[PDB]
Design a protein around this nucleic acid. Structure first.
Ligand code: MG
Ligand code: MG
Ligand code: MG
Ligand code: MG
Ligand code: MG
Ligand code: MG
Ligand code: MG
Ligand code: MG
Ligand code: MG
Ligand code: MG
Ligand code: MG
Ligand code: MG
Ligand code: MG
Ligand code: MG
Ligand code: MG
Ligand code: MG
Ligand code: MG
Ligand code: MG
Ligand code: MG
Ligand code: MG
Ligand code: MG
Ligand code: MG
Ligand code: MG
Ligand code: MG
Ligand code: MG
Ligand code: MG
Ligand code: MG
Ligand code: MG
Ligand code: MG
Ligand code: MG
Ligand code: MG
Ligand code: MG
Ligand code: MG
Ligand code: MG
Ligand code: MG
Ligand code: MG
Ligand code: MG
Ligand code: MG
Ligand code: MG
Ligand code: MG
Ligand code: MG
Ligand code: MG
Ligand code: MG
Ligand code: MG
Ligand code: MG
Ligand code: MG
Ligand code: MG
Ligand code: MG
Ligand code: MG
Ligand code: MG
Ligand code: MG
Ligand code: MG
Ligand code: MG
Ligand code: MG
Ligand code: MG
Ligand code: MG
Ligand code: MG
Ligand code: MG
Ligand code: MG
Ligand code: MG
Ligand code: MG
Ligand code: MG
Ligand code: MG
Ligand code: MG
Ligand code: MG
Ligand code: MG
Ligand code: MG
Ligand code: MG
Ligand code: MG
Ligand code: MG
Ligand code: MG
Ligand code: MG
Ligand code: MG
Ligand code: MG
Ligand code: MG
Ligand code: MG
Ligand code: MG
Ligand code: MG
Ligand code: MG
Ligand code: MG
Ligand code: MG
Ligand code: MG
Ligand code: MG
Ligand code: MG
Ligand code: MG
Ligand code: MG
Ligand code: MG
Ligand code: MG
Ligand code: MG
Ligand code: MG
Ligand code: MG
Ligand code: MG
Ligand code: MG
Ligand code: MG
Ligand code: MG
Ligand code: MG
Ligand code: MG
Ligand code: MG
Ligand code: MG
Ligand code: MG
Ligand code: MG
Ligand code: MG
Ligand code: MG
Ligand code: MG
Ligand code: MG
Ligand code: MG
Ligand code: ZN
Lengths: 79, 63, 49
RNA sequence: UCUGAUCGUAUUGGGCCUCUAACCUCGGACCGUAUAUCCGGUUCAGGGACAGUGCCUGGUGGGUAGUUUAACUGGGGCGGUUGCCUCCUAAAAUGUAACGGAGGCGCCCAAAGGUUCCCUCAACCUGGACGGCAAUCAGGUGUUGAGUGUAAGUGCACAAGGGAGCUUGACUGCGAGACGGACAUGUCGAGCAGGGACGAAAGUCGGGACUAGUGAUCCGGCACCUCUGAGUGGAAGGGG
RNA sequence: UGCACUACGAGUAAAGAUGCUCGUUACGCGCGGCAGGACGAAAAGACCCCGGGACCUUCACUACAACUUGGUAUUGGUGC
RNA sequence: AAAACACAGGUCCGUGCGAAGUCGCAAGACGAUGUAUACGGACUGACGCCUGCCCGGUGCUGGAAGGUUAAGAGGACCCGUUAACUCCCUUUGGGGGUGAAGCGGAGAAUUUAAGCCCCAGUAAACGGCGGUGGUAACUAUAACAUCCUAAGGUAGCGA
RNA sequence: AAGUCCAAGAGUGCGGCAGUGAGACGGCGGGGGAUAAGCUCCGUGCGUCGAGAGGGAAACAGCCCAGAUCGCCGGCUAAG
RNA sequence: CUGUGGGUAGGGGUGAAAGGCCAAUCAAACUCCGUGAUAGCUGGUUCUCCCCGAAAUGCAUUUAGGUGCAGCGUCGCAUG
RNA sequence: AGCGAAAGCGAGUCUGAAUAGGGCGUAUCCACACAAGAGUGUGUGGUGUAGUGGUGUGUUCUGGACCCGAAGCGGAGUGA
RNA sequence: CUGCUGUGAAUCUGCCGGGACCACCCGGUAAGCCUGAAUACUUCCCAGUGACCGAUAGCGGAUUAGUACCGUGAGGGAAU
RNA sequence: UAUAUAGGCGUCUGGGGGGAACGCGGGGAAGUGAAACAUCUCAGUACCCGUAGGAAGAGAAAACAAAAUGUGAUUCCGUG
């Protein structure tokens, strides 16, 4: 007459936060995730909870490097 | 009769030189051992009250 | 408790700088480690209070 | 002049048997008082420093008084549930409800933290005394099916998995820029300086492969500080 | 007692219609009767839920009366 | 309007006397111009035969060797203030340490009542009254060995 | 990159004044239920009703057409 | 049984006990006063036109028919 | 005239060991330089900074506070 | 500052206060008593005034008005 | 019952009751608010009791103050 379940946790709002070709500031976090689904690419660092962030200003762009999806920051030219 | 300032809110909120109302962050009075110092120091100093709460806090402060 | 809260104090100035936990079943003796003392200015041994 | 077995004086308590004089008697008589089971007085007879009563104090105390006794909910009740974490529902961004479908949490580890270096499992075949498919040895095949403290998911063989050395960064002063957000919470973070660890150096280190292991404010405790101190100096008290 | 020159049937509609649809029936006005309907009148449902009361019970809470303990004042004397 | 209340009868408990109980802040009053063959309270309910067990729980009553405990007496020890010094270290001061008395603050040992724990009695006090393992007359009709308790339904009655 | 641009009467920021926090059915994707309900619970730069008049569906909030500034004894059409 | 006179008063009285009765009222009489008690509840709130125009969701809630903040309307200013 | 818990200092001030970052503050705009394109800063000049008191309107606070409505609670009295 | 209870001093090199307390300084002189003015109100009397009402208004009462009437009573209480 | 007192007799002089508000000294709620409620509030309010006066009460420092060669009884009003 009772359900032995009915509990869940809060949604953590994970996922890609900046997509390809998007200009970011240095320090912006770019994708929140659990494991390493996206590996840190060139000029992109990885946080303690596996959060990828940008170590330099530029444009986001994804890639594959030896069978590993990677995220990179590309230096846009100064006008 | 002259209006009364809400005393519980005056000992919690303060105004700066320009007139924005500042605050004190919570979760820093006890049970501190398990909190990393990064969490501890992102929780101190003042911070401006939200625009959503600025309307009621103003009425509590002016009475 | 078996993992109680403990405090560490510098020997050369007796100031309590850090609070941590440890297992009393596994570390019955006072825990001592070389920590950093803000007023001594350098790393000093710190012993359980 | 301490150690002691001692008597006495001055003083003050604890107790005991008493005495009467406070106080008490609805015991008698007499009087105010012609009238009076009131009342007061006088006196005899009894208690008696007790009792009663003030003040302070501990018990017992529905005798009375004021009140409280949650919500969700396919009506209500009875059951079950209430915070956090993971997955599916959830319709390939995020978010998404039901008493929808499954499980975990309220810890643990002074190493199971930091760094430096080194290694690759599980399973299967073959050869070996106990020893059997199975325990340890040797040869081979074996790219991940093993393992990762702990649920599940995302990861990890480049290893985040296995082993050893040293060691405490399970730091102090901070923090550009952001994610998430009714708000309050929360989450990531390069980089600078102090003082260190490891490393030849490059460099990495603000606990743990990651996401649970938690409780706002009030009020109070404690240690430290260069703050304050109700005329002044202290203190008490407050403050950081 | 909102009205008014207030039929029926099968429907439709806040799901049980005199008043809407489509058809059927019906000259106008009364008197005596009957109670099928007007979810008829009456009484801001008393059942049930929600909020609030009130009185009752008790090892609910917190108090107080009452009862009781001791100290001390009233309260003193001699002997041990 | 009843089967309910009352009742005459029964018991239990309290009360030694301006009793106990009740109405009152008190004085005072009823009880009662009564005095345990009386009065109050509780249950039962003429009569007849009877009224089992359990005192562990909770009350009531009684007791005291201990444990625990208020106010009150006690003020060891500590802290504040400062007469005095005593020193530097710079000089007409000013901080270090000690610090008597006096006044203040926190106050331990020690001592002390009832209650509670404790131990007894009490059920016409509020209350409670069991099973299992395998069995025969023609099936029976629960009254062989053992577990548990404070004790395991007595008499009578019983769709 | 354009479009719309004498308008969407559009975004965003600050402020004054709000109401709302009982939604309904229909189309598509689903949970609960018996792949029942005019059932219940979610998603939808989906619609309409709510807060919508007019025409169609006999009548018939939520379906189809179409959004009522007023007048006309003009014309053309939409669903049907 | 009854007449006349009298006594008991509201958390009180009285009850051969039904919560009975105490002035047509009683699980605490009535009158006045506190007082215009308080009600997250129901009801009502009065002339006109012009422009714009919702929500019935999220989060928290001694919370679930109430409220706060967000979302969504309007007006003023800024930007464009 | 602000910063600071405060002593205090003052176009600064707090934190800090830091001419080392950040917080708050120095109306606002203009230019010229000197530094980096990690979001612009720093500095020299310039411009120079707007409040207050009546009163209308909207909302609000304290008051019965838009109007109406309990069952009930208290004080003092009236009734056998 | 002050009530009830207990204990209980000094007469000026005294005693009190200056937000626990102590020291120093300063102010004052308790346990005795009187005291005008400036301040509060209007039963009643006089004289006035009103961007006050004008007979369902204004006092309950423009008229038999605390009247008639209702109640055992406190009390309620018109209409003209 | 001796001292005597309690009492008794006589002769005077006062007291008593009423009143709308204002004063002073005492006793002292609850509705309510706190979105429950008990501290708290309401509120020392309502009510009650004792007493006045034309006003009352207070009043002549055992006060403030803060190092100023400062104020100087009380009451009331405005600020703070
Ligand atoms: Mg999840
Ligand atoms: Mg890490
Ligand atoms: Mg204040
Ligand atoms: Mg703290
Ligand atoms: Mg810390
Ligand atoms: Mg060890
Ligand atoms: Mg005595
Ligand atoms: Mg006594
Ligand atoms: Mg009680
Ligand atoms: Mg009660
Ligand atoms: Mg109440
Ligand atoms: Mg409720
Ligand atoms: Mg409910
Ligand atoms: Mg149900
Ligand atoms: Mg149902
Ligand atoms: Mg998704
Ligand atoms: Mg999707
Ligand atoms: Mg949803
Ligand atoms: Mg669980
Ligand atoms: Mg590890
Ligand atoms: Mg290590
Ligand atoms: Mg091998
Ligand atoms: Mg490893
Ligand atoms: Mg730690
Ligand atoms: Mg930041
Ligand atoms: Mg370094
Ligand atoms: Mg770092
Ligand atoms: Mg971590
Ligand atoms: Mg609080
Ligand atoms: Mg002082
Ligand atoms: Mg001082
Ligand atoms: Mg201190
Ligand atoms: Mg029909
Ligand atoms: Mg029909
Ligand atoms: Mg019809
Ligand atoms: Mg018609
Ligand atoms: Mg007829
Ligand atoms: Mg009829
Ligand atoms: Mg008839
Ligand atoms: Mg009816
Ligand atoms: Mg109703
Ligand atoms: Mg109810
Ligand atoms: Mg009969
Ligand atoms: Mg009858
Ligand atoms: Mg009966
Ligand atoms: Mg008898
Ligand atoms: Mg008995
Ligand atoms: Mg007696
Ligand atoms: Mg007897
Ligand atoms: Mg009987
Ligand atoms: Mg019998
Ligand atoms: Mg018996
Ligand atoms: Mg027994
Ligand atoms: Mg027993
Ligand atoms: Mg017993
Ligand atoms: Mg016994
Ligand atoms: Mg006893
Ligand atoms: Mg004492
Ligand atoms: Mg039978
Ligand atoms: Mg366009
Ligand atoms: Mg337009
Ligand atoms: Mg618009
Ligand atoms: Mg709601
Ligand atoms: Mg809703
Ligand atoms: Mg809906
Ligand atoms: Mg529906
Ligand atoms: Mg569907
Ligand atoms: Mg479903
Ligand atoms: Mg439906
Ligand atoms: Mg839909
Ligand atoms: Mg509506
Ligand atoms: Mg329409
Ligand atoms: Mg519409
Ligand atoms: Mg269509
Ligand atoms: Mg045509
Ligand atoms: Mg056509
Ligand atoms: Mg008679
Ligand atoms: Mg009579
Ligand atoms: Mg009664
Ligand atoms: Mg009457
Ligand atoms: Mg009656
Ligand atoms: Mg009553
Ligand atoms: Mg009552
Ligand atoms: Mg009131
Ligand atoms: Mg009202
Ligand atoms: Mg419009
Ligand atoms: Mg709102
Ligand atoms: Mg707005
Ligand atoms: Mg300031
Ligand atoms: Mg700090
Ligand atoms: Mg700065
Ligand atoms: Mg102006
Ligand atoms: Mg204005
Ligand atoms: Mg009443
Ligand atoms: Mg009477
Ligand atoms: Mg005087
Ligand atoms: Mg009139
Ligand atoms: Mg007229
Ligand atoms: Mg009238
Ligand atoms: Mg009469
Ligand atoms: Mg008089
Ligand atoms: Mg109250
Ligand atoms: Mg309340
Ligand atoms: Mg309320
Ligand atoms: Mg005068
Ligand atoms: Mg006078
Ligand atoms: Zn140190």
């Amino acid at each position: 007459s009772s359900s032995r379940n009915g509990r869940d946790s809060a949604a953590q709002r994970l996922g890609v936060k900046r997509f390809g070709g998007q200009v970011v500031k240095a320090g912006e976090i770019l994708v929140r995730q659990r494991g390493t689904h996206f590996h840190p690419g060139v000029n992109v660092g990885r946080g303690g909870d596996d959060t990828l962030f940008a170590l330099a200003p530029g444009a986001v762009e994804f890639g594959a490097k030896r069978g590993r999806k990677t995220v990179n920051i590309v230096p846009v030219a100064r006008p | 009769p002259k209006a009364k300032t809400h005393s519980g809110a005056s000992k919690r909120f303060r105004r700066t030189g320009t007139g924005k109302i500042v605050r004190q962050k919570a979760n820093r009075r006890h049970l501190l051992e398990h909190k990393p110092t990064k969490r501890t120091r992102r929780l101190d100093g003042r911070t401006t009250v939200s625009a959503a709460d600025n309307s009621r806090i103003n009425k509590l402060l002016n009475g | 408790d078996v993992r109680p809260k403990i405090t560490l104090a510098c020997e050369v100035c007796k100031h309590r700088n850090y609070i941590t936990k440890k297992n009393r079943r596994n570390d019955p003796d006072r825990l001592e480690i070389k920590k950093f003392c803000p007023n001594c200015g350098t790393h000093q041994p710190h012993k359980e209070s």
